[PDB]
Amino acid sequence: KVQYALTIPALLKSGETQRACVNLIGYHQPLALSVVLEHQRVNISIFSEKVQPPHYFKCNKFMVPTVITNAPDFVTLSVSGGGEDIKDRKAVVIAPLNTICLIQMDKPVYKPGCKVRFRLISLNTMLLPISEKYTAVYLEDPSGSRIAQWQNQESVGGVVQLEFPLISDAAPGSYTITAEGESCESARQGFTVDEYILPRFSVIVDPPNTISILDDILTLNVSAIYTYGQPVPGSVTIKCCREASSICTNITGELGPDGAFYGVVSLLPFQMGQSGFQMSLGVALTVTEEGTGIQVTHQFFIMITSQLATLIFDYDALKEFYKRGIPYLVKVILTDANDNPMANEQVEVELAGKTIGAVLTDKEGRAEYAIDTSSFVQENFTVVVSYENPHQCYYTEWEGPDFPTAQHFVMRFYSETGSFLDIQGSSVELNCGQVHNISVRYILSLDGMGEGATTATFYYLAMSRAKIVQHGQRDVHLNQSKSGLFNIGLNVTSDLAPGAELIVYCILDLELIADTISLDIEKCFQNQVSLSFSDDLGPTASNVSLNLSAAPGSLCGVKVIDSSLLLINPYESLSASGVYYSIPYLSLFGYNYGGFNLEEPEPPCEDPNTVIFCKGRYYLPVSSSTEGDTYQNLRRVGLVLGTSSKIRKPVVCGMEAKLRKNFSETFLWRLVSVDSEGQNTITETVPDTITKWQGSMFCVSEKEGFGITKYSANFTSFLPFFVELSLPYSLTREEILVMKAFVSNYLEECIKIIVTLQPSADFEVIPQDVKQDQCICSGGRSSYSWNIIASSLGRISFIVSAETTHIGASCDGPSDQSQSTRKDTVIQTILVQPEGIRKEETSSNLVCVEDSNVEMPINLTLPENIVQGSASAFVTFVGDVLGLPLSNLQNLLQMPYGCGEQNLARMAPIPYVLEYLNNTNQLTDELLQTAVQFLNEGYYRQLRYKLPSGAYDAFWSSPSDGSSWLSAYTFKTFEKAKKYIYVDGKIQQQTLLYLQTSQKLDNGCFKAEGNLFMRQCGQERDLCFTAYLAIALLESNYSSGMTLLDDALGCLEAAMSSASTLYFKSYTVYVFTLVQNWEIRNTLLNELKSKVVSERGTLHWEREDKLGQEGIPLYYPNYSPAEVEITAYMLLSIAKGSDPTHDDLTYMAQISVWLIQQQNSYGGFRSTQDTVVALQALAFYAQLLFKSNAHHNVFLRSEYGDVGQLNLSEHNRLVVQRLQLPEVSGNYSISINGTGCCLVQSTIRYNIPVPKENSAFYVAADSVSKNCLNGVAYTITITVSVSYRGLRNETNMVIIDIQMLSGYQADYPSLRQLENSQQVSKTEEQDNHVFLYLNAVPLKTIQLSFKVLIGSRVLNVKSASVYVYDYYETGENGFASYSQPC
């Protein structure tokens, strides 16, 4: 006879080689086989062999033709021979496959100020590199807007390397990535960038997390640590209790040796064992400090349990089918409390309703019994196990059983002739390169394969992902009668991916009996990599050598990362399992694939009313609904058989189925290629940070594949001799500060040390007369200190030193030849600044000389009551009119930034100045690069304030329903500045749509949102906003056909009779110049020209604020910021004329000289909204006046001699000439000769001691101590009061900046508390100044309060200053003093 079997997967994978296995047996004459995978048109030739005598088990390769959409095909088998011929036809589905794109994100957690290092990898379905082209690689901020994009990223070796710096702001959240490709669909990825906050404490506690009722002691192992690993002396108090139904205890302790508290808590006061239960013991632990009153609180709940003993079923062994004659292996796992093994115990197993086993455990709660399954013909067979011991404490709560109990429900396994195969499953990860010997048990009954032959062959098959690999045959000699086991020599290799399913079957005479399991294989990646450093230990500035080897001809990307991250976010992208799980169809399940059943029709149902004469009684057929046989053993692995033998159970009708570390950057990111066998040496330089240096790589090759390293190589860099200095940021003149130098020894031998401070003449040092050579040893640190007099000015550097005379063997034993000399000197910086506040006085001038000479003097007069020693006289020359605001673009104004409008002053005038430079043939490559960098940084900073509604608002920390004016400003600036840097079009579209929806048409006028920007225009706020919206629309390159623009022009047309405001008239003039008009613009500017204020050679427009024209109630400040904006629009409008005539160039000069007069030493004029417009107008005006050569030589003289002889030319046209007068009270006179226009600026810088003598913006600051001890107080509390006493309608956004009291620091929790509370819109700290942005300050006094810690202690502390000023009008300001509470 002929018995045959095809084994093929049901779902073939297109384009990759698979295997088909054939199992012919029984025949005697030679045969001729043919297997064809009938595609649409072509015939494949899987087998075309001449088969010869019996036992033909061969499994042959074939290539699946590539197909783009899953399609069903047939497999035909022919057995043509001399005798019987067999024809068979099964069905399979050929499926398509994509290519996989992966993102390697090194440094899993990111912080602001870092560099995100991409890596795109494209792979075939088999892990091989392919060339891939990308078109839409870009990032996305948590707000959902694209930040950066790359175009046409071509892959060189299947890997694309990208970099992206992250701005110092870096809005915390989860940035995402999109990487669209010609084959991939979306290679999405995520970030976990978090705000870098470093709390001064970190408390560590590890509760048992579960306590039994019969427990009397609860032990706590709690400690606390600083940020940099220092002990925290103080008091730790812990209070724990619980509620009862419908008592508390508390203990305290002290620490200090190293930081540790063994907080034993007795449960006797607690009602453990009584009705005062709540199943949860709450615990609150608080740690404090002796000096500072700051405390850290940590609360956790400890579970209260009652089930002391637990018995469970391990669902790895203990299969769900029972076979006749094969013992059923019952394995029970016994654990107590928090999952601990048990000693010798008896678990009683009930088979059906009677205990049969009484199994003793194996000293680890791993008990096993062998239920004899012979003569079981039932269909359910529920086995139950229990922990019967009438001594344990088992008081259940949910009215459950009184002893641990588990139940397992099984099924019956069918086989026609009577024979069964079982495979002893494995519950461990099988390693690569090792032959394994999985065991198979078999019952092979009589009346089956045939008595008289004591030999049986069991065929053997494995399935890795969707393909058959490692076929085999194991033949057994039946020396005994019918039972036993044999070993399967499986050869696990890298070609078996995770999840390899094993199949063993035997074909007896008419029955094919098969059993399958689901082995787990470790991930080996068919490649080998041997990343390894050349030394585990080294100094902090050593030359690290790295020796990597892999498969020949491999492109191989390396990475070295601080492992401090892996203790925070242990989720590495591109792990050993992510790659493998990114593979389609790695474990077939059934026959339903792509909407195709692939299942042959069921056989006919046997009639259940036909009697049977079996032994002596009539019988009737019966079949279980839920059962298992060979067919359900397959159809689960996924194979397709075509055997003649029976593989399905019979069925009868009527019974159917129915962040705490300062980790540094990755210092190598190379992508090296491997030459020959592979001995590449990667050489880099280690950074200074003292951490771990775990190294990994992914190492692809076009021939074999890539192998990720398994155990990352580890490196450690440390300094044997540590010296550290702690200093405050700034100090006050003639103040006695103490220096604290920590010297530490990490050598195994005890050492001595001598430390010396280099004396200097700039600053004096108090001779402390302290000298002790402490015999410090391993794990120790000293606290040598010195007294420093701050009798100097400005920047001073402190240098410490060491000599390391040690006598290593303790102190008595001489070192001899053990060490020679260790040198470690650390530089430190200090800035001493005179007492008082800073003041400036700038008088800029423009010189227009045509072969003439100018001898203007310098009119400088230091004010009376001035601090001596703080005085400097400064002179600035620039070769171009708009030349100075080029080196100071990022710091155009000294004001603190952080609001929406404030931020649009470091990127708003840069497009205009760049356009001016490009137009007057002066742009340079590096200057353009710097301008682009500034623009891009500004875009990153400003993108943070965007609301999801599409509108832009200030104070992202305190959102309020968007701000229409700020949205218009940001939209206009982005549209103007999208020529150079990348700008998302969706963001502009969304903001424009928000402007669309912001109709709110009060009569014919638009209405603006927010109430903190046009606070000075009065009731005309709507008209002013409409005019500004029109200005933005015109100068964003929009024609007058838009609906918003047409409506705005219609609104502005009917405004001449009303709108008697000199602020609104300027806006209307500018918009009617932008919309080129001859009559309306002309008559409006003719009206405005009448109200011009004339000075000596300069013309400008005052605010014309008739309401309250006085000088005492805060109206004396002459430099009103408002008039600068109006004059700048006036200059812009007159410049944007039809043809500037000779009678109008003089007007240009007379309006520009005054405007350029109000320019500070940095470029900013008066405020952000003013300096932006002033710079734009100055750029446009200087566009119309330019000299090719512009010869200028300038020299400054005094009554004693000539200071300097500077020269200005084309080469010296964009760099600023800076000079300092040696004498601050001299008699100086400058001289400029040549032709052209130049700027000369003379400034005086000094200090004044808080001139609080007059009526102003009333500010009063005072303080209280809380922890005042022996003089200096550890914690301070500042409370300030602000009130407004001027004559204005309402006030605008105001800032109060407080200078910290010498060497103190801001209390970040207190500042954050002020931020969360709704009194200050935003709080910021930098360089010992804290800025608080108040939205408004009314006549009613506003009181604020916040705390301040102590850093480096200092005595003889002088006063500090609190300064309040309106951000948009610095004329109304107030000063207040601040003193130490003690």
Ligand X SMILES: *[C@@H]1O[C@H](CO)[C@@H](O)[C@H](O)[C@H]1NC(C)=O
CA dihedral 1156, 1161, 1164, 1167 (to 10 degrees): -100
Cα 1321 to Cα 1296: distance, rounded to the nearest angstrom? 12
Provide, rounded to whole angstroms, the least separation between the CB of residue 1381 and ligand X: 29
Provide, rounded to whole angstroms, the least separation between the CB of residue 701 and ligand X: 18
529 binds ligand X (CB under 6 A): no
- By C-beta, is 196 or 394 nearer to ligand X? 196
Provide, rounded to whole angstroms, the least separation between the CB of residue 763 and ligand X: 25
Provide, rounded to whole angstroms, the least separation between the CB of residue 366 and ligand X: 22
Subset of 471-490 contacting ligand X (CB under 6 A): 487
Cα 476 to Cα 481: distance, rounded to the nearest angstrom? 12
| Interface stretch with ligand X, choices 184-192, 627-635, 709-717, 1255-1263 (CB under 6 A) | 709-717
- By C-beta, is 646 or 1245 nearer to ligand X? 1245
- Reference 1064, options 1117, 1012, 1018; nearest CA is 1018
Binding mask 812-841 for ligand X (x = CB under 6 A): -----------------------------x
- By C-beta, is 1083 or 1229 nearer to ligand X? 1229
711 binds ligand X (CB under 6 A): yes
Provide, rounded to whole angstroms, the least separation between the CB of residue 668 and ligand X: 14
- Reference 181, options 140, 137, 149, 139; nearest CA is 137
Subset of 668-697 contacting ligand X (CB under 6 A): 685, 689
Beta pairing partners, 385: 349, 406
1038 binds ligand X (CB under 6 A): yes
Subset of 300-339 contacting ligand X (CB under 6 A): none
| Interface stretch with ligand X, choices 143-151, 362-370, 573-581, 708-716 (CB under 6 A) | 708-716
What Å distances lie between residue 937 and 117, 139, 1235, CA to CA?
A: 18, 16, 39
Subset of 53-92 contacting ligand X (CB under 6 A): 60-61, 76
Residues in the chain: 1382
Beta pairing partners, 673: 555
1059 binds ligand X (CB under 6 A): no
Cα 777 to Cα 752: distance, rounded to the nearest angstrom? 8
Q: Out of 212, 235, 295, 493, which residue is the one contacting ligand X (CB under 6 A)?
A: 493
- Locate all alpha helices (DSSP H) within 998-1119, ordered by sequence: 1021-1035, 1043-1053, 1062-1074, 1080-1090
- By C-beta, is 1100 or 1192 nearer to ligand X? 1192
- By C-beta, is 603 or 1204 nearer to ligand X? 1204
- By C-beta, is 432 or 1080 nearer to ligand X? 432
How crowded is the C-beta side of 817, counted as CA atoms within 13 Å? Answer: 0
Q: Tokens for 782? A: 């000293």
614 binds ligand X (CB under 6 A): no
| Interface stretch with ligand X, choices 36-44, 265-273, 1085-1093, 1354-1362 (CB under 6 A) | 36-44
| Interface stretch with ligand X, choices 605-613, 630-638, 705-713, 1160-1168 (CB under 6 A) | 705-713
Subset of 211-230 contacting ligand X (CB under 6 A): 221
Sequence-distant (≥ 6) Cβ neighbours of residue 943 within 8 angstroms: 141, 143, 145, 147, 171, 987
CA 1002 to chain centre: 46
Q: Tokens for 1072? A: 């009617």
Sequence-distant (≥ 6) Cβ neighbours of residue 399 within 8 angstroms: none
Cα 1282 to Cα 1269: distance, rounded to the nearest angstrom? 31
- Strands 1373-1378 and 1360-1366 turn out to be antiparallel
1193 binds ligand X (CB under 6 A): yes
Q: Tokens for 139? A: 């990032």
Measure the CA angle with vertex 350, ends 344 and 351; round to 5°: 130
Subset of 394-453 contacting ligand X (CB under 6 A): 409, 435-437
What Å distances lie between residue 1251 and 732, 868, 955, 1299, 1371, CA to CA?
A: 18, 16, 32, 16, 15
Q: Out of 29, 38, 355, 1210, which residue is the one contacting ligand X (CB under 6 A)?
A: 38
Q: Are 971 and 994 in contact (CB under 8 A)?
A: no
- By C-beta, is 406 or 713 nearer to ligand X? 713
With H, G, I as helix, E, B as strand and everything else as coil, classify residue 829.
strand
Provide, rounded to whole angstroms, the least separation between the CB of residue 862 and ligand X: 9
Q: Out of 36, 406, 905, 1008, which residue is the one contacting ligand X (CB under 6 A)?
A: 36
Subset of 1279-1298 contacting ligand X (CB under 6 A): 1289
Q: Out of 338, 380, 999, 1279, which residue is the one contacting ligand X (CB under 6 A)?
A: 380
Q: Out of 202, 664, 833, 1082, which residue is the one contacting ligand X (CB under 6 A)?
A: 664
861 binds ligand X (CB under 6 A): yes
Provide, rounded to whole angstroms, the least separation between the CB of residue 32 and ligand X: 11
- By C-beta, is 48 or 1011 nearer to ligand X? 48
Cα 569 to Cα 105: distance, rounded to the nearest angstrom? 13
Chain position carrying tokens 């279980």: 624
- By C-beta, is 958 or 1235 nearer to ligand X? 1235
- By C-beta, is 660 or 986 nearer to ligand X? 660
Q: Classify residue 1333 by its DSSP letter.
A: E
1039 binds ligand X (CB under 6 A): yes
Cα 538 to Cα 1235: distance, rounded to the nearest angstrom? 64
**Size, binding site for ligand X by CB under 6 A:** 51
Beta pairing partners, 407: 384
Q: Classify residue 66 by its DSSP letter.
A: P
Provide, rounded to whole angstroms, the least separation between the CB of residue 42 and ligand X: 8
Chain position carrying tokens 């036809």: 89
Provide, rounded to whole angstroms, the least separation between the CB of residue 1191 and ligand X: 7
Binding mask 130-169 for ligand X (x = CB under 6 A): ----------------------------------------
Q: Out of 632, 1207, 1243, 1313, which residue is the one contacting ligand X (CB under 6 A)?
A: 1207
| Interface stretch with ligand X, choices 337-345, 638-646, 712-720, 1215-1223 (CB under 6 A) | 712-720
- By C-beta, is 76 or 1265 nearer to ligand X? 76
Chain position carrying tokens 């103080």: 234
714 binds ligand X (CB under 6 A): yes
Q: Out of 1227, 1316, 1343, 1379, which residue is the one contacting ligand X (CB under 6 A)?
A: 1227
- By C-beta, is 918 or 1060 nearer to ligand X? 918
Q: Tokens for 1216? A: 């600023």
Q: Are 1282 and 1340 in contact (CB under 8 A)?
A: no
Q: Out of 84, 204, 262, 264, which residue is the one contacting ligand X (CB under 6 A)?
A: 262
- By C-beta, is 467 or 946 nearer to ligand X? 467
- Reference 1272, options 1249, 1250, 1302; nearest CA is 1302
Sign, Cα dihedral of 1103, 1104, 1106, 1112: positive
- Reference 1348, options 1257, 1272, 1283; nearest CA is 1272
Provide, rounded to whole angstroms, the least separation between the CB of residue 49 and ligand X: 4
Q: Are 943 and 144 in contact (CB under 8 A)?
A: no
Name the helix (H) or strand (E) containing 473.
strand 468-477
The backbone torsions φ and ψ at residue 1181, rounded to the nearest 5 degrees and listed phi first, read -70, -45
Binding interface with ligand X (CB under 6 A)? 36, 38, 43, 47-49, 60-61, 76, 221, 239, 250-252, 260, 262, 380, 382, 409, 435-437, 487, 491, 493, 543, 662, 664, 685, 689, 711-714, 841, 851, 859, 861, 918, 923, 928, 1037-1039, 1193, 1207, 1227, 1233-1235, 1289
